[PDB]
Amino acid sequence: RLMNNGVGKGKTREDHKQVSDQLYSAYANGVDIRKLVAIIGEDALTENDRRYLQFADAFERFFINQGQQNRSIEESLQIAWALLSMLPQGELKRISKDHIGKYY
Amino acid sequence: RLMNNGVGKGKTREDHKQVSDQLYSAYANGVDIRKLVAIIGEDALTENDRRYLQFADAFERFFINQGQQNRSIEESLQIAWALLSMLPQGELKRISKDHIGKYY
Amino acid sequence: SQVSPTRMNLLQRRGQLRLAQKGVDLLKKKRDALVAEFFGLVREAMEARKALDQAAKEAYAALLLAQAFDGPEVVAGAALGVPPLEGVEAEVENVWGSKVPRLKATFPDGALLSPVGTPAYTLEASRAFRRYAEALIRVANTETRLKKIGEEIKKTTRRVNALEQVVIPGIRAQIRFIQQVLEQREREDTFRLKRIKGKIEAREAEEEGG
């Protein structure tokens, strides 16, 4: 919770901020769906919100799990995009269209 | 703690002693209802439940608040009587049985 | 009697909320969607119905035309080309919002059974009955959805309330009660220890002194 003035631009890469905060709210958002399975499945919902299910799935699999594989920040950034690829823009909206328009 | 020194006529009016418990017992029979309202809907009723309702409704800022109007046992009780007139005055039974006529 | 154990359970009862608090919240607005959504069907339900009720009413009233009097005749004279009554084939719609019966009473209501077109008003009018049957279904089936949609909401809130309005603060006050006693224990210790220090120090005053 201290790294505001840690996150930085072309320095530690500008876009990282909002990208983080994409996946931030997005991850947690998908944990919202997570349970409600016994309710109507999670197949009876609507698609968009369902998409955040897939968000998780890849989040835990790809993004988190990394065995011992020495990752790299840049490789880590890749992930973001990919997972977000499950999603149209219009969900992708911390970020400005240029950046997602650079990472998709 | 004391409520029976200073009491009874020769110290009081007839009704001081009585309309105490009346009111008490009145308000009570309000409150119960108001609990159950959102949690049974408004589908079980009588209109003497609409009445016990209405005493409580009555009882509120109408009675309880009196601002800084310098009161008296009269000034009070008069409108204490008002409340009871909502009700079947026959269903005031913490009084004399003609007290319903010894004030309204 | 039945109160605490007094102890360490604290942590579980701390966890009480974890379970409770977090789950239960969310449950409310889930179904809120569905009830919202219900309304489209309700709106549509009567739409054609009321319209085509009056375009029912045509035929009903055109009974009386040259066959008000032959309503008497007709009620025999046209009546039985088809099972009257039932064919109510009870349907489940199975959802959150459980299962209740709906149905299509899928047997025909018929209208042809007579030749020439016989007395005339009859056939077209009997044809109107279709437009009773069929049409009545919309509402028959949307309102059974209604009853589902009542239940949930109502039931729902009943628990919402409960959680909100007894559960949490009750269990709060438990912890506290516990805590406080546990905590106060510290003192007693100390209280003891104090005296102990007193001892050590008394020893050390009159074994070093004397």
UniProtKB/Swiss-Prot annotation, chains A, B:
Q: Which domain of life is it from?
A: Bacteria
Q: What role is this protein assigned?
A: Produces ATP from ADP in the presence of a proton gradient across the membrane. The V-type beta chain is a regulatory subunit.
The record's family statement is: Belongs to the ATPase alpha/beta chains family.
Stated name of the protein: V-type ATP synthase beta chain
- Its source organism is Thermus thermophilus (strain ATCC 27634 / DSM 579 / HB8)
State start and end of the fragment within the whole protein: 360 to 463 of 478
From Swiss-Prot, chain C:
* Molecular function per GO: ATP binding; proton-transporting ATP synthase activity, rotational mechanism; proton-transporting ATPase activity, rotational mechanism
Which cysteines bridge via disulfide bonds? Answer: none
Record GO biological process: proton motive force-driven plasma membrane ATP synthesis
Keyword Ion transport carried by entry: yes
Provide the alphabetized UniProt keywords.
ATP synthesis, Hydrogen ion transport, Ion transport, Transport
Q: Output the Pfam families linked to this UniProt entry.
A: ATP-synt_D
- Name the InterPro entries for this protein: V_ATPase_D
Q: Gene3D superfamilies, from UniProt? A: 1.10.287.3240
State its role: Produces ATP from ADP in the presence of a proton gradient across the membrane.
Q: Which family does it belong to?
A: Belongs to the V-ATPase D subunit family.
Report the protein name in the record.
V-type ATP synthase subunit D
